[PDB]
Amino acid sequence: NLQNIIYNPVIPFVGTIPDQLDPGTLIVIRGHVPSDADRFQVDLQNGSSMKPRADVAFHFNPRFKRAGCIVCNTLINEKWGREEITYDTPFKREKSFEIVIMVLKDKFQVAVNGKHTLLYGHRIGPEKIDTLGIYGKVNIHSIGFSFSSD
Amino acid sequence: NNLQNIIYNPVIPFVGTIPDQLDPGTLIVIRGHVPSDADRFQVDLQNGSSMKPRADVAFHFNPRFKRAGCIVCNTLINEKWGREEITYDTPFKREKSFEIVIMVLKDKFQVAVNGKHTLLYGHRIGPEKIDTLGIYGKVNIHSIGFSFS
Ligand SMILES: OC[C@H]1O[C@@H](O[C@H]2[C@H](O)[C@@H](O)[C@H](O)O[C@@H]2CO)[C@H](O)[C@@H](O)[C@H]1O
Ligand SMILES: OC[C@H]1O[C@@H](O[C@H]2[C@H](O)[C@@H](O)[C@H](O)O[C@@H]2CO)[C@H](O)[C@@H](O)[C@H]1O
Ligand SMILES: [Cl-]
Ligand SMILES: [Cl-]
Ligand SMILES: [Cl-]
């Protein structure tokens, strides 16, 4: 059911999501971490404004320093909320990945390389998300959606 | 019989509490028969048993028998149905017995009937929210049991 919106995008990438993130929607992102990455992020946004910065419903932020971790959070009206830090991370420098974000009624579920990684409860209604951004030190092969509606 | 909380010949419609969480690898095993004149039946994995307002249905597994037959799968959230996922390759038949095995995975249900893979259904509600098994419609149930993880 997977409809890619882009292949091999320049980073940072900001694109419109062409349908609503209804429960059962999948987001699939394939890419590769450069050898000298410190971090990258996948942001599910309400719009693409820079000034002031668009709300980030779901900020998914792998960080590579020390033992590595993933930080998840939400940006509302240019303020970050409570960090949810996952210390069990599958990402590594100079390694390829496939991220699958499953949109559920109450939360996102993320799996990497076919293995569950983390959950993150909705803080912004997922119906408000219309934009996906990818930022930081990462190579992206593809970004696709499997919409519930299709 | 390694199954757990086995019930025979429940009264239909059946609404029962699932006796443990639907963790990955959990099985729900339902043996029964399709009446000769069935239109449809359903197996519903529900968040509670409220009738009004109607409990959320994480997984509605709905064999339909008109025309060439099919299985409709869907989810009910806050009393509204989502987009149907229709399986046209259906193993069910009027007057035929079945054994349904629902395997719960972290990201989907995997359903087999009489030992044959039937369909996949990706989660729309987290399966940890499911505490209730409903069986409704034109169907005969011989047994229900579970294999937990
Ligand atoms: O919360 C996501 C957000 O983190 C910012 O950095 C935080 C940092 O994670 C924390 O350990 C420190 O105590 O506060 C910092 C200031 O906000 C990042 O700057 C931002 O890009 C997001 O990743
Ligand atoms: O989707 C499950 C749901 O279907 C309802 O019937 C649908 C029907 O399948 C569809 O063809 C039509 O467009 O809308 C009907 C109402 O949503 C059933 O009423 C319900 O019991 C479930 O089986
Ligand atoms: Cl940021
Ligand atoms: Cl949920
Ligand atoms: Cl119904």
Side-chain angles (χ1 to χ4, degrees):
Chain A
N1 190 31
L2 184 57
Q3 293 294 337
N4 286 319
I5 64 162
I6 203 83
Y7 297 82
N8 299 328
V10 169
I11 301 305
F13 175 73
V14 182
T16 302
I17 303 176
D19 213 332
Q20 184 170 331
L21 296 186
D22 287 332
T25 296
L26 308 174
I27 310 176
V28 179
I29 301 165
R30 290 178 60 76
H32 179 94
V33 181
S35 67
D36 66 336
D38 273 349
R39 49 174 281 171
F40 77 87
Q41 69 212 64
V42 179
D43 292 340
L44 304 185
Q45 300 173 189
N46 185 350
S48 58
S49 186
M50 307 297 273
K51 196 178 284 292
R53 182 174 170 189
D55 293 349
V56 180
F58 182 38
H59 172 68
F60 176 89
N61 179 210
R63 299 184 181 183
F64 296 91
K65 288 230 239 303
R66 305 151 174 86
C69 64
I70 309 162
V71 175
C72 301
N73 203 349
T74 298
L75 186 84
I76 296 164
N77 296 330
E78 298 198 305
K79 304 170 277 187
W80 287 113
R82 174 180 53 74
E83 292 186 343
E84 301 185 15
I85 305 179
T86 293
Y87 284 107
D88 297 302
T89 174
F91 296 100
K92 289 296 199 183
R93 292 157 172 158
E94 202 71 285
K95 295 198 193 174
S96 299
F97 61 79
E98 183 170 286
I99 295 164
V100 179
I101 305 171
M102 178 172 61
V103 184
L104 305 171
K105 177 183 174 179
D106 287 337
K107 57 182 159 293
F108 300 102
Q109 179 181 327
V110 183
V112 178
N113 307 329
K115 181 186 266 287
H116 178 69
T117 304
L118 60 78
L119 303 182
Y120 188 86
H122 300 307
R123 301 188 190 166
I124 299 184
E127 70 286 347
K128 293 212 190 125
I129 301 166
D130 65 10
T131 301
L132 186 152
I134 302 183
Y135 314 86
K137 285 212 186 162
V138 70
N139 313 314
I140 299 298
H141 312 322
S142 60
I143 307 169
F145 300 86
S146 179
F147 292 107
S148 319
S149 68
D150 297 326
Chain B
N1 180 351
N2 280 324
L3 292 175
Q4 306 172 256
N5 289 72
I6 314 167
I7 298 182
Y8 290 83
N9 306 307
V11 171
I12 307 300
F14 175 81
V15 186
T17 298
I18 297 174
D20 207 342
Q21 189 167 285
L22 295 186
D23 299 315
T26 295
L27 309 174
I28 307 170
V29 181
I30 300 171
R31 292 169 62 88
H33 185 89
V34 180
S36 72
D37 58 344
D39 53 352
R40 52 175 282 173
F41 72 89
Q42 70 210 66
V43 175
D44 290 337
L45 304 188
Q46 298 176 195
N47 178 9
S49 50
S50 189
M51 288 175 63
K52 191 205 171 163
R54 184 163 175 193
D56 290 354
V57 182
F59 187 34
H60 169 73
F61 175 87
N62 175 217
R64 300 183 183 188
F65 292 93
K66 298 183 209 259
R67 306 283 187 189
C70 59
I71 302 160
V72 168
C73 297
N74 206 351
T75 298
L76 185 84
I77 291 166
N78 303 337
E79 300 192 299
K80 284 306 197 278
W81 288 111
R83 182 220 138 87
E84 292 175 341
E85 303 181 23
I86 308 181
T87 292
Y88 291 105
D89 292 350
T90 174
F92 293 103
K93 195 169 179 290
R94 288 162 172 154
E95 210 69 282
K96 189 176 197 189
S97 295
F98 61 76
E99 176 167 276
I100 295 165
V101 180
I102 307 171
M103 185 174 51
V104 188
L105 297 181
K106 187 78 174 184
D107 62 333
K108 63 187 145 286
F109 302 96
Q110 181 196 120
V111 184
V113 176
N114 288 6
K116 296 186 170 77
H117 178 69
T118 304
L119 64 75
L120 301 176
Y121 183 85
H123 295 314
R124 305 195 183 159
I125 301 176
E128 74 291 350
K129 300 284 177 67
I130 300 166
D131 68 0
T132 300
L133 172 62
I135 303 173
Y136 313 95
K138 288 313 186 93
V139 74
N140 293 340
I141 301 296
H142 305 165
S143 61
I144 301 164
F146 299 88
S147 182
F148 287 112
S149 53

